[PDB]
Amino acid sequence: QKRAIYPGTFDPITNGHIDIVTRATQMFDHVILAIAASPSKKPMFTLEERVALAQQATAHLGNVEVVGFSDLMANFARNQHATVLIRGLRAVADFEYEMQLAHMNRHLMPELESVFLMPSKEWSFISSSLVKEVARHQGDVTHFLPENVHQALMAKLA
Amino acid sequence: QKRAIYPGTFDPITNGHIDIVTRATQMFDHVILAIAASPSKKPMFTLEERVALAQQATAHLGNVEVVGFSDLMANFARNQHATVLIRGLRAVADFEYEMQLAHMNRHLMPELESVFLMPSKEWSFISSSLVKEVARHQGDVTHFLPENVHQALMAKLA
Amino acid sequence: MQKRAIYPGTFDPITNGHIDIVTRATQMFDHVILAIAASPSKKPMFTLEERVALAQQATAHLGNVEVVGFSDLMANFARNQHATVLIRGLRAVADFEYEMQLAHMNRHLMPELESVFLMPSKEWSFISSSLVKEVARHQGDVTHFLPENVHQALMAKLAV
Amino acid sequence: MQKRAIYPGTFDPITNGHIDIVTRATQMFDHVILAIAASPSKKPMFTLEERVALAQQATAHLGNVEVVGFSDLMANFARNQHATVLIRGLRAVADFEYEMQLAHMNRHLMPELESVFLMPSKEWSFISSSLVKEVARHQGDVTHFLPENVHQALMAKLAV
Amino acid sequence: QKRAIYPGTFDPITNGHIDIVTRATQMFDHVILAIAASPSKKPMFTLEERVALAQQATAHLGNVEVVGFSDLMANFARNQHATVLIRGLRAVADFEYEMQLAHMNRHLMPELESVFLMPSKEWSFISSSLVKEVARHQGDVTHFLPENVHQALMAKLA
Amino acid sequence: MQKRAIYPGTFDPITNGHIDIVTRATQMFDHVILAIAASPSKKPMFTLEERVALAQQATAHLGNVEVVGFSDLMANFARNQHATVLIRGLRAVADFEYEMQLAHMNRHLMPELESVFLMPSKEWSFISSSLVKEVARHQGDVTHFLPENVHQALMAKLAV
Ligand SMILES: COC(=O)N1CCC(Cc2cccc([C@@H](CC#N)Nc3nc4ccc(C)nc4[nH]3)c2)CC1
Ligand SMILES: COC(=O)N1CCC(Cc2cccc([C@@H](CC#N)Nc3nc4ccc(C)nc4[nH]3)c2)CC1
Ligand SMILES: COC(=O)N1CCC(Cc2cccc([C@@H](CC#N)Nc3nc4ccc(C)nc4[nH]3)c2)CC1
Ligand SMILES: COC(=O)N1CCC(Cc2cccc([C@@H](CC#N)Nc3nc4ccc(C)nc4[nH]3)c2)CC1
Ligand SMILES: COC(=O)N1CCC(Cc2cccc([C@@H](CC#N)Nc3nc4ccc(C)nc4[nH]3)c2)CC1
Ligand SMILES: COC(=O)N1CCC(Cc2cccc([C@@H](CC#N)Nc3nc4ccc(C)nc4[nH]3)c2)CC1
């Protein structure tokens, strides 16, 4: 059984994240979608809300498990018996930062392999931050989010 | 009548911004310089101060109108009957972020066309943030700002 | 304002990415010159006559586009055509760096010519005439990336 | 899942950077095809027969690697080999831009082939076969960057 | 006597910073390692703590002087009689920002020359921010910091 | 400290951007070697004898510059010249990526040679000898970017 972990803040999970986790499930037997509590980033949604939204949005994928965590990434990957860490590519700044995290994780857990996937062109210019900024100014973001997430975001801002 | 909108936080408007709006007035019949309230960025100058400084700095250009806004960018462009959105180029991080905003705006208002202009080499390495950081440590920033803006910045920090 | 804009390139061959950029340019300027380089440094796959005829047929539906071959310095041709706007597409970071170096050079050569950068549809962001030609030469499907007339001409060129 | 992955390139010659990437790929996929381009656009320093034999000897210790020459479009070969994973190494920003353009093209050509990007050790992040060959041609020491068999073959090639 | 200044926030000084200051001492007769108070960045360590840690970490290098400052960079360089400003290279975002600072400093002090050095591959993916993020989640950062700094960081988080 | 620095390149021809970098290097190091590559991969527009004479006349006002031709690996020449500092100019992001790959290679070849990167004036940030030559070949004005002697030599070369 090959196990992969797809970590992030997912505040909230977008169609870009759904695209990446879907591609990961086609490659690995079991995928853990791991949501960091991230209190320092002051998230819009609590960890419990982010886990519930991601569980609903990924329910149609049989080999995805959604979990919350506050541990060091490398420790949580070891403790989930995962040997693959999935990241999505986007911008240069993200890529250069992903290279720093991958080299750090290699020092913390040498057998944990960083794997980068490319999202569909459709979602290659979106992020949780951009969707929230548009929604805060009442712009239509229905195209970018799963249905349950779009309702939760509208309710949170209401 | 071809109408263009040049949006930003302009906190405060610099000679780099004057250069871009001047180039835009040579291309389009009417240019709206649109200042976002931007409370989340905690601006140094209030919106009323930023509008007044920009009005004084652009008074010599007959086809510029300075306006403040708190709306979604795409909605404000539609409501001003503009079909061109002017941006200035600077760094890679800015460019990659401009590409995300342009693709989002295309989803919100397909007929709104993002147009990128290049500032003079003279202003290609300045920003409102950099000028404010230098001024906060008493460095001479007279070369980078219109006269009225330089006086207002010195007064604000005094 | 009756603006004349120039959109220069080798267009070897013209792709849907080029059509996207020129269509956007016609929606903001009164007249657009699609300027095709006569003699690029590397021998083109299509001759200037073929490149011009392909671009003309592919832009015929846009009433304010003029397709014209040129052999001078791009800025010398733009000056003689009374163009005041120079159109270039920005696909990614590699485009951004190179285009900024050319724009500072063109501003030195012709200060009255303003460089305007447009963004193509996400559909054409990763394509270039070079990549399309390379894929087609190695027996890959490129139909989606080209106007029909160009697809037909490229198939005929690769058959021989 | 019994995944077949393809790691394509010119491998002219195979370096320790390539060995690093293929070793990581064998640690996550059941079978890895190290696919060597038969006829690149620029004449290679080593013939296809030399490139294949060097890569075979340098990967012989990895039981689930198969070294194979190919002349078709990379995606056409991957489809015929039943590969569902495409392996590429990402060294720096220049790699990132070019690889993203190729990945969108490969997804159009073969949607069932997923591009997976791996990162080499810091030890090999700045090297390429091109830089190694250029340094060695101008009498610089490149022993550290190559498997022993490749070091021997490169010295013999440069001696004549 | 050729004098160089190596400025930064050094919150805390890492092995990457030690590598850069060591390379600078091999090139220039006297190197001032200058620590900015940086209250706007809300540092983990006070300026007095950062100066003491850097003094201990660089004590083995005879031509390094550690000093704290709150002045404009260009003014502090002039006042130290330095004509060389040392920077370490890392990512594109850093490089583009270094180009803006270098062009600004050239306007403030034309004779002050910005010199960029490249750290060892060993430290090319680390930063003070990354080390602190790992340490805050109890990850082992002993490899990345001088001994005295590692003890101080563990004590600060305890 | 009596530092010897090396500033290598093809200098085909030397531009005001090169003069800017070498002038800054003379203001921080006791002796600067302006090292000109004898045999680059692509045939240069100017012969080594022409490149050397142009660089000598253009740097004659700087007393601590020595112009010297070299054909070895740059690091082998730097070692034999007792240089401990290697000077390179950083114009933009494309320069940054390539220069970092060369600096790690040079550190492996000659660990005692420290790579030092300088920034040119904003006036010369977008220029290269390649862009200047291309503009001049296509009848564009490049007088502003070159020392007077180079402007004269380039006009004479393009006239024939
Ligand atoms: C290769 O990918 C990654 O390595 N990471 C980093 C984690 C990140 C998710 C995240 C966000 C905010 C806080 C955390 C907290 C837990 C909480 N709450 N844990 C944590 N922080 C880290 C920072 C750096 C490194 C190397 N390890 C870390 N571990 C995690 C996804 C991408
Ligand atoms: C193509 O250019 C741009 O699209 N934008 C984005 C806006 C930005 C100005 C700005 C700053 C801070 C807040 C706002 C607020 C109003 C206030 N106060 N509106 C707003 N935020 C947005 C974020 C993303 C998008 C797609 N649309 C937005 N609309 C605007 C200039 C560059
Ligand atoms: C803003 O964009 C551009 O400026 N350029 C450059 C031109 C280039 C088209 C092209 C290709 C090959 C040869 C030429 C020849 C004509 C023929 N045959 N003229 C020409 N070469 C140049 C190289 C540099 C510069 C600044 N100006 C040039 N003018 C043109 C599109 C992108
Ligand atoms: C994801 O990576 C890649 O997609 N490619 C491209 C291939 C390349 C290896 C290579 C070199 C030279 C010629 C070929 C020839 C076969 C021979 N001989 N086939 C080939 N050329 C191509 C160019 C572009 C694309 C999308 N597909 C191609 N397929 C292959 C490694 C990196
Ligand atoms: C070429 O390098 C640099 O120029 N700088 C910039 C400084 C920076 C250190 C630093 C951090 C935080 C605050 C300061 C404060 C002092 C305190 N406390 N002074 C200060 N801020 C500045 C921002 C911009 C410029 C051009 N000059 C500045 N001078 C310094 C290292 C890299
Ligand atoms: C830090 O900068 C550089 O390292 N280089 C590389 C050299 C280059 C000048 C040059 C051009 C063409 C041929 C040579 C030939 C001599 C002749 N003729 N020597 C040479 N080639 C090399 C390629 C790579 C490396 C690492 N070392 C080399 N040494 C030199 C300036 C920028």
Q: Is the CA virtual torsion F47, F48, F49, F51 positive or negative? A: positive
The residue written with tokens 């990659």 in the block is B96
Task: State the count of interchain CB pairs (< 8 A) between B and F.
Answer: 8
Task: Give the Cα separation of B92 and F82 in Å (integer).
Answer: 38
Contact C85, C29 (CB under 8 A): yes
| CA D63 from centre of chain | 17
Domain boundaries, chain A: 1-158
Q: How far is CA C38 from CA B25, C8, C73, C134, F138, in A?
A: 34, 11, 11, 22, 12
Q: Is D91 a catalytic residue?
A: yes
Q: Would you state the structure tokens that stand for residue E74, as one six-digit string?
A: 């260009």
Task: Give the Cα separation of D72 and C135 in Å (integer).
Answer: 10
Residue E48 DSSP SS3? helix
Q: What is the DSSP secondary structure assignment for residue E64, as one 8-state letter?
A: E
Q: Is A17 a catalytic residue?
A: yes
Partners of A3 in the β-ladder: A30
Contact B112, B78 (CB under 8 A): yes
Task: Give the Cα separation of F149 and F157 in Å (integer).
Answer: 12
**How many CB atoms lie under 10 A from the CB of residue B99?**
23
* A43: preceding bond cis by omega (within 30 degrees): no
F-contacting chains (≥3 CB pairs under 8 Å): B, C, D, E
Contact D12, D40 (CB under 8 A): yes
Task: Give the Cα separation of F126 and F156 in Å (integer).
Answer: 25
Q: Is the CA virtual torsion B143, B144, B150, B153 positive or negative? A: negative
| CATH of the domain spanning B1-158 | 3.40.50.620
Task: Give the Cα separation of E55 and E59 in Å (integer).
Answer: 6
Q: Would you state the structure tokens that stand for residue B156, as one six-digit string?
A: 């604000």
Pick the atom of ligand 3 nearest to C8's CA.
Answer: 31
Contacts of D25 (CB under 8 A, 6+ apart): D5, D7, D32, D87, D118
Contact D114, A23 (CB under 8 A): yes
Distance C11 CA to ligand 3 centre (A): 12
DSSP alpha helix (H) spans, chain C? 16-26, 48-59, 74-80, 93-109, 129-137, 148-159
In the sheet where A113-117 sits, what is the strand order? A64-69, A30-36, A3-8, A84-88, A113-117, D114-118, D85-89, D4-9, D31-37, D65-70
Fold of D1-160: Rossmann fold (3.40.50)
Q: How much is the CA Rg of chain C, to the nearest whole Å?
A: 15
Give the residue numbers in E contacting A (CB under 8 Å), as ranges.
91-93, 125-127, 130, 134, 137-140, 143
Q: Would you state the structure tokens that stand for residue C116, as one six-digit string?
A: 């305007």
Q: How far is CA C17 from CA C11, C98, C125, E76, E103, in A?
A: 10, 18, 7, 52, 37
DSSP alpha helix (H) spans, chain A? 15-25, 47-58, 73-79, 92-108, 128-136, 147-157
**Quick one: which of B57, B50, B76, B61 has its CA closest to B27?**
B61
Q: Would you state the structure tokens that stand for residue D1, as one six-digit string?
A: 């899942």
Q: Would you state the structure tokens that stand for residue D102, as one six-digit string?
A: 């190729």
The upper half-sphere exposure of residue D82, i.e. CA atoms within 13 Å in the direction of its Cβ, equals 5
Q: Would you state the structure tokens that stand for residue F67, as one six-digit string?
A: 């112009």
- Phi then psi for D93, rounded to 5 degrees? -55, -40
- Phi then psi for F50, rounded to 5 degrees? -70, -45
**Quick one: which of F103, A94, F75, F99 has its CA closest to E119?**
F103
Residue type (1 letter), A67:
V
- Nearest listed ligand to the Cα of residue B98: 2
Which string of DSSP letters, residue by residue, matches D71-119?
Answer: -S-HHHHHHHTT--EEEEE--SHHHHHHHHHHHHHHHHH-TT-EEEEE-
Task: Give the Cα separation of E131 and E127 in Å (integer).
Answer: 6
Per this entry, what is the length of chain F?
160
The residue written with tokens 């951007």 in the block is F17
The residue written with tokens 């040049």 in the block is B6
Contact A83, D102 (CB under 8 A): no
Q: Is F160 exposed, middle or buried (0-12, 13-18, 19+ CB in 10 A)?
A: exposed
**How many CB atoms lie under 10 A from the CB of residue D126?**
23
Contacts of A57 (CB under 8 A, 6+ apart): A13, A18, A146, A148, A149
Contacts of A59 (CB under 8 A, 6+ apart): none
b/e map of F91-105 (b: 16 or more CB within 10 Å)?
A: bbbbbbbebbbbbbb
Q: Is D71 a catalytic residue?
A: no
B114 annotated as a binding-site residue: no
Contact residues, chain F, for D94 at CB < 8 Å: 97-98
- Nearest listed ligand to the Cα of residue C134: 4
Give the residue numbers in A contacting D (CB under 8 Å), as ranges.
2, 23, 26-29, 83-84, 89, 92, 95-96, 99, 102-103, 111, 113-118, 121
b/e map of F3-41 (b: 16 or more CB within 10 Å)?
A: bbbbbbbbbbbbbbbbbbbbbbbbebbebbbbbbbeeee
Give the residue numbers in C contacting F (CB under 8 Å), as ranges.
72-76, 93, 97-98, 100-101, 104-105, 108-109
**Quick one: which of A24, A101, A37 has its CA closest to A65?**
A24
Q: Would you state the structure tokens that stand for residue A127, as one six-digit string?
A: 């992020």
Contacts of D69 (CB under 8 A, 6+ apart): D35, D36, D37, D38, D48, D51, D52
Q: How far is CA E12 from CA C100, E4, E35, F56, F133, in A?
A: 38, 21, 10, 47, 48
The residue written with tokens 């709006």 in the block is B21
Task: Give the Cα separation of E29 and E27 in Å (integer).
Answer: 7
Residue type (1 letter), F40:
P
Q: Would you state the structure tokens that stand for residue B96, as one six-digit string?
A: 């990659």
Contact F33, F6 (CB under 8 A): yes
Technique employed here was X-ray
Resolution in A: 1.9
Contact D81, D48 (CB under 8 A): no
Active-site pick, C91, C107, C151, C157: C91
* B12: preceding bond cis by omega (within 30 degrees): yes
Q: Would you state the structure tokens that stand for residue E98, as one six-digit string?
A: 């270094």
Q: Is A41 a catalytic residue?
A: yes
Task: Indicate the Cα dihedral angle A34, A39, A43, A44, nearest 10°.
Answer: 110
Contact F144, F127 (CB under 8 A): no
What angle do the packed helices D48-59 and D148-159 form, to 10 degrees? 150
Q: Would you state the structure tokens that stand for residue D105, as one six-digit string?
A: 């093209």
Partners of F17 in the β-ladder: none
Task: Give the Cα separation of D26 and B143 in Å (integer).
Answer: 59
Tell if the CB–CB gap between E137 and A72 is shorter than 8 Å: yes
**Quick one: which of B117, B148, B119 has its CA closest to B49?**
B148
Q: What is the DSSP secondary structure assignment for residue E121, as one 8-state letter?
A: G
Task: Give the Cα separation of E149 and D91 in Å (integer).
Answer: 31
Contact D9, D112 (CB under 8 A): no
Per this entry, what is the length of chain D?
160
Residue F81 DSSP SS3? coil
Q: Would you state the structure tokens that stand for residue C30, as one six-digit string?
A: 């009164």
Residue type (1 letter), C29:
F
Tell if the CB–CB gap between F105 and D127 is shorter than 8 Å: yes
Instruction: Give the residue, by CA position, lying nearest to ligand 3 atom 32.
Output: C9
What angle do the packed helices D93-109 and C93-109 form, to 10 degrees? 110
Q: Would you state the structure tokens that stand for residue C134, as one six-digit string?
A: 């390379």
Distance F108 CA to ligand 6 centre (A): 15
Contacts of C30 (CB under 8 A, 6+ apart): C2, C3, C4, C64
Residue F19 DSSP SS3? helix
Contact A92, D93 (CB under 8 A): yes
